[PDB]
Every structure is written in C-alpha cells, then in structure tokens.
C-alpha cells in the first residue's frame, strides 16, 4: 500500500530571520538592525512570506543555518509518503522508489520505521519516506 501527498499549507517561498547580537562588545546599529538575513526555497512558485525570530546570539552564518533547518523541515513535510512492505535496515537510509501512476522516480530518505506482528501471522512494516 502507499499514500503520497503534497500540501501547500506547509510551504513558504521566502523565510526571514531577525535577532540581536550578544558578543563581548557589540551594540548600536551593528547589534540591533544589522543582523538580518533572508533565504528562499524557489521550489514553490507562489508568494507566501514568513518571518521568524532568533533565540540566541545572532550571527550572519547562524541566521542562514536556522533558515535552512526550517526549509528542510517544511520541504519534507510537504511530500510525506507511506508504504507497507509485508515481510520484515535502518532509518535515514537511501532508497529508490517507483510509482509510475503518480510518477515517483526520485531518491528518498526514510524518516521512520515500524515493525508490527500479530498472533494471526500478520507481519508488516511501514515507512515514512521523504526527499
């Protein structure tokens, strides 16, 4: 069995971050207004702006890393898949998939794994792939 999905309610084309600096001696315009950075996905073809606040010591490198983390989370959440593979290695692996009816021909990284058994012989296993 399988169930693909593509939800637009969990994507954003442009994410913005903000946050002050807390270094030994930084203040004024260099620690209040200066630290701003923007990162964009470019896969979504619409305008869905988002803005985030940073909880920490803002640095221009750290601003993008937080931005990328959100991008990977949103991207994965917008292509969740489920599969059942009957008979019963690890998560995060790399697999190839083929579902021509919807046209899946892309590499995937498994995000979850589950082994289930029953007294009536019903073995199964589930996956939560995402690219």
């Amino acid at each position: 069995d399988f169930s693909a999905e593509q939800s637009e309610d969990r994507a954003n084309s442009e994410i913005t971050v903000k946050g002050h600096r807390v270094a030994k001696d930084v203040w004024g315009k260099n620690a209040i207004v200066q630290p701003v950075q923007s990162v964009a996905d470019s896969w979504v073809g619409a305008n869905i702006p988002l803005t985030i606040q940073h909880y920490g010591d803002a640095t221009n490198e750290s601003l993008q890393r937080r931005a990328k983390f959100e991008a990977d989370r949103r991207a994965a959440e917008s292509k969740s898949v489920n599969v059942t593979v009957f008979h019963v290695w690890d998560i995060g692996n790399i697999h190839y998939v083929e579902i021509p009816p919807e046209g899946i021909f892309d590499v995937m990284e498994c995000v979850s794994l589950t082994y289930s058994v029953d007294a009536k012989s019903t073995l199964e296993t589930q996956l939560e792939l995402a690219p």
Partner: protein, 133 residues
C-alpha cells in the same frame, strides 16, 4: 431407555413456576466454563487459563389441550410477566431459581384450533446483596 418397564411419570418431575403448575413438553439446558485460550507467534505450543463458571440457561415448551385453553394460557402469561425471579421446578434438573427472559405464544384458528403452544427461555438468577459484597 432400556427394557420395557419404564414409567415416565415416575422419572420426570412435574413442572411449575412460582407455584402455578403447567404441563411441560421439552427440557433443555446449557452449561460450560469460561476459558482464555491463547496462542503465541512462531510457537509450537499453546496455553489455557480458567476464568470461572458460565451462567446456565433453560428452555421449556408447554402445551395446553384441555377445554378452554385460552383462559389457562392467557392466565399463565400474567405470571411470567410478574416482577422478579421465582422458584422453577425443572422437569429433570430439579428445583432451581430462574427469571423468564422471553416467551413466544403460537396459535391459529384454522390450521390448529384447540391447542396452544408457548416456548420459554429461562435464566439462572441467584440473589445478591445491594452493597456489591
């Protein structure tokens, strides 16, 4: 049975319920015991566990042939509907306490006029105190 010297009037008790006699025509019962059988996965051995006794149940059938059977039959239904359980003299199981659970009265005017059948379905009912023990 064995031998020609049987006397059914001597081996079967006369039925009754709450003291009103009636003519019995059949006698069944159901007993048993509650199990918890379990079978594991990939295993060649099984298990079992006892959980207690199962509630009994009795079913009887009555026939009314005498003159004016409608009054006796109609008057007997007024006893099965009386509130609460009462003593029952099962033809073979002896005196037990039971409560009527259902009763279907069959009758016809052209197919069979002059005889009324009534099936019953009893359940064992032992009195219990109200303070949950």
């Amino acid at each position: 049975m064995a031998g020609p010297c049987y006397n059914p009037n001597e081996h079967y008790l006369p039925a009754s319920f709450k003291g009103v006699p009636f003519d019995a025509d059949s006698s069944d019962s159901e007993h048993g015991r509650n199990g918890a059988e379990a079978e594991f996965v990939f295993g060649e051995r099984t298990g079992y566990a006892d959980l207690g006794i199962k509630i009994r149940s009795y079913s009887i059938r009555a026939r009314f042939q005498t003159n004016d059977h409608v009054a006796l039959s109609n008057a007997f239904i007024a006893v099965l509907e009386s509130t609460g359980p009462g003593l029952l003299v099962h033809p073979t199981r002896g005196p037990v306490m039971a409560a009527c659970r259902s009763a279907r009265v069959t009758d016809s005017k052209v197919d069979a006029a002059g005889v009324t059948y009534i099936d019953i379905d009893f359940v064992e009912a032992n009195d219990t105190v109200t303070g949950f023990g």
